Amino acid sequence: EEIKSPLPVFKEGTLANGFRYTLVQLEGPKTRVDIRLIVDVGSIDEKDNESGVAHMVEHMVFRASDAFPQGVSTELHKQGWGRGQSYNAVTNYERTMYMMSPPKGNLDLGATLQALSQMTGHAKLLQSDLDDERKIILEEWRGKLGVAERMNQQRVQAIRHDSRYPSRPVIGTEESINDTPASVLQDFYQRWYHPSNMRLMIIGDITPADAEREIQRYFAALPNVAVPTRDYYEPLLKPQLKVARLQDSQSGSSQVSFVYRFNDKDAFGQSEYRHRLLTQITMSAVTRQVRRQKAELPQDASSLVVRKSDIGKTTAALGFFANVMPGGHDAAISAVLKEIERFKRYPLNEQDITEITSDIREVAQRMSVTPETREFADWVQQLTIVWQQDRPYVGSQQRGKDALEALDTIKGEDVNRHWQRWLASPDTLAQFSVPGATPFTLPKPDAISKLQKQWALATLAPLRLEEKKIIPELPSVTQSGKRTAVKTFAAQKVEQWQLSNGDRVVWLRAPEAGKKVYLTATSQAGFMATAMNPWQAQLASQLVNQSGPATWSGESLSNWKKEKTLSLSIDQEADQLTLSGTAPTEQLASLFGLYRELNVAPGIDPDVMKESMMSLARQKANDDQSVGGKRASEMTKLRFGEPAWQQPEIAELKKISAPALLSQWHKAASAPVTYYLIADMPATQLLPQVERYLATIPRQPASEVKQHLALSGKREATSAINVEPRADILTWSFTPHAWTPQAAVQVSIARNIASKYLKTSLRDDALGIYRMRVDSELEDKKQRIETEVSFTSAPERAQELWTLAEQAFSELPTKITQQDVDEQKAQFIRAEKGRQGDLTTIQRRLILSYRHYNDPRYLSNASKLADSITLESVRAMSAKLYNPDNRVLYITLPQE
Amino acid sequence: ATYKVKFITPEGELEVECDDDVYVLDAAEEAGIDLPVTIET
Amino acid sequence: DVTIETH
Ligand SMILES: [Hg+2]
Ligand SMILES: [Hg+2]
Ligand SMILES: [Hg+2]
Ligand SMILES: [Hg+2]
Ligand SMILES: [Hg+2]
């Protein structure tokens, strides 16, 4: 797709049996092709006894067929095709789609078409193949069982109530996957898989005459059988105020919404294209306005947004959603209904509509005179979109002319009328998500309409106007400090500078910095420092990171950085504070200047704070009764005895004030800093900027913060609380070992080989292991080899998995082969020399060096790292990866 | 082994913290972020 | 939906 190809020539056809095809010839990259077939059947067409059958047929048509009794995907493998790269399929509510990218492009077109015709017209759907395949469909189902899917099903259930969608999820049930016989799949195939229910599109380097012959060859003989007529794609819209709870015990969702459902494709006798353009203008106007209405929200509600979505072929949902402070759902739904009422009473901002309409006209103008040229993958993207909805493609040049035509028939009166139609839709829905165990009784419809009538009768202020944009500028800094000492490490190209405020600079003049300056500012101000309140310090760090300096805002901070191509981020860990940033060398004063302003003039953006409190509070409510909440608590007790700190109660959360947080930040900002600066410039250029912006920041000595250290010993625990049918097995082990680069390298090698050995030694598929992980490192701050072995598996033999891994660990130090080390040493040498000149690696090693030696020696003599990899050393270290004296085992089983 | 994932959407940047063993949409839903490493959507 | 992409 290197040279863009122009708008292609399209040829369409219909075989006698009703099979439709679309041929799209690109000047295109040479020989590349893309071949799609759609069968117009999805899970919505399943009957009550056919749960998930559409998706199972999708799998099964790659099995035995009349011409390939060993399976269609078997032959595809033989001829070089790869699962997911060369062939793929997807099933959704309404269609099943098969996609092919033959490895040899257009030369395999006949082969591809033979394969597709086999799948769609000659699949055997054999019981014996199905019993083999249902293990693969059950895995697909297990990996789909999280909170995100259960909540998605909650959303479909509510917003698509009174339709076929809620009872027809694509995957179907574990019962049907396990019990449904091939005979049911066969009847479904024979009901729906007929040529007039099918269409095919071929894109790329093709001769349309030749492709049409291959298509006649492989599809013309398929018998012309009708499929049932269907008119059940829409929810049954009726006047109503439905109330729903969106609920899952593992979800932190905390949210109210009010939703309008309506026929969105009805253009009311006017232009379909013009209608869609009215929708874009309106949604853009409403999106602009509803953001300004944030000023009107009470403390219980935030981030009110408007979202429009398809919920059928013709039905759409227009919804107002807002985040809710847990326990404030009643106040929040009222606040949402108040704003909806305000939109019913005032017209949309005329200037917004003027501007938005003008932006569109400028793009439609450019489109209408620019010749359309795209890369291959982009052509495929554009064309599949229109083809999936069974519509002809209209080029961007023609569509620019159509927009300009429609824009001439569109005044703000139309936009307002378009918008008020939506808000007058009689089919309505109110939704509540209330996290955890928050007291909640679902409002009755009358309670909701009561609030509607209260606001319909109320006096309401006009829509908010656009606020002036604040244009941030860094202050002038006239005071200067001084460098008071220089220590030189010429062999590493490093200078170390003491500054008058007690900070220091570690400056590496690395040519690899190019025309950029890289800053890492560290200090001992982690949130576990003695003077701080842990949770509040952490919230403070996050709020200042997003807000920027006192007189700025989160948004203006983000624009200002983009305009200077500059980054700077706060990260407060338990034991240290790191501010990291990059800028072009010409922007140095802006990088240092912003750094200093975060230190002495931090800001708290009131909207950011309100949003962060809601995030913390809904998570608190969820974590207090969630599975993950209990696992975190149990792992914490097993490994540490007590939590180092905790989140507060929601009631304390509500009371936190900006000055209390800024107090915490200033405590962190006062610990003295080491500036790791990587910049290829002369000292004379860097020193004045360091003395002006960095040596002038007030500091007081900080103490080193004690590490949170996992306790010695052997302890275990087993909890049957998992809501999904899986077992989670975690095991932790550690051995104190002094850190050196050599020792750290040996641990990583031992863990590579141990990873291989422990995965074959537990390779038996009867154990039921879905996922397995062996992690081990010589943690340099704690100076201990920490090892972590994780399993996710079927419950039945989960109690055997750690025993077998413990087994495999005891064997490992003698089973390690000289050949094993040889290929690791060789592959390490490859990665190490790939890391030469790597800025990230250089930065990390400069900081490691200073942490452990208080000098930059580690930047030299990386070459003799490889030399520490031997059989005798890797094995001596493989013995220390697991320490039976320090072993914590935690087993989560499905709930009883 | 905790990491941080950032999300780009028409409303704005959203950030969530997830374990190694955690699917990305599950950590968002557990965090109470309503969507449908730095991944794009 | 966006019928004419602007940004
Ligand atoms: Hg699937
Ligand atoms: Hg055929
Ligand atoms: Hg920043
Ligand atoms: Hg301060
Ligand atoms: Hg800890």
Residue numbers in the entry:
A (entry chain A): 26 to 921
B (entry chain F): 2 to 37, 86 to 90
C (entry chain C): 134 to 140
From the article:
The study is based on structural and biophysical characterization of a key M16 family protease, FusC, resident inside the bacterial outer membrane. The crystal structure of FusC from Pectobacterium demonstrated the structural characteristics of an M16 protease and further revealed a plausible import mechanism for ferredoxin, an iron-bearing protein from plants. The crystal structure demonstrated that FusC has the four characteristic domains of an M16 protease, creating the entire “clamshell” structure from a single polypeptide. The first of these domains would correspond to the catalytically active β-subunit of MPP, housing the active site residues with a metal ion coordinated by two histidine residues (H80 and H84) and a glutamic acid (E165).
The structure of the FusC:ferredoxin complex was solved using mercury single-wavelength anomalous dispersion (HgSAD) data at 2.3 Å from an ethyl mercury phosphate (C2H5HgPO4)-soaked crystal. The structures of FusC:ferredoxin, FusC:ferredoxin (C2H5HgPO4), and FusC(E83A):ferredoxin were refined to 2.7, 2.3, and 1.9 Å, respectively. In these crystal forms, peptide densities were detected that correspond to the plant ferredoxin. These peptides define two distinct binding sites for ferredoxin in the cavity of the FusC structure. Density corresponding to a ferredoxin polypeptide was observed in the crystal structure at a site referred to as F1. This site tethers the ferredoxin by interaction of residues 84–90 into a hydrophobic pocket in FusC. Furthermore, given that residues 86–90 of ferredoxin are capable of interacting with either F1 or F2, these must represent alternative binding events on two different populations of FusC within the crystal lattice.
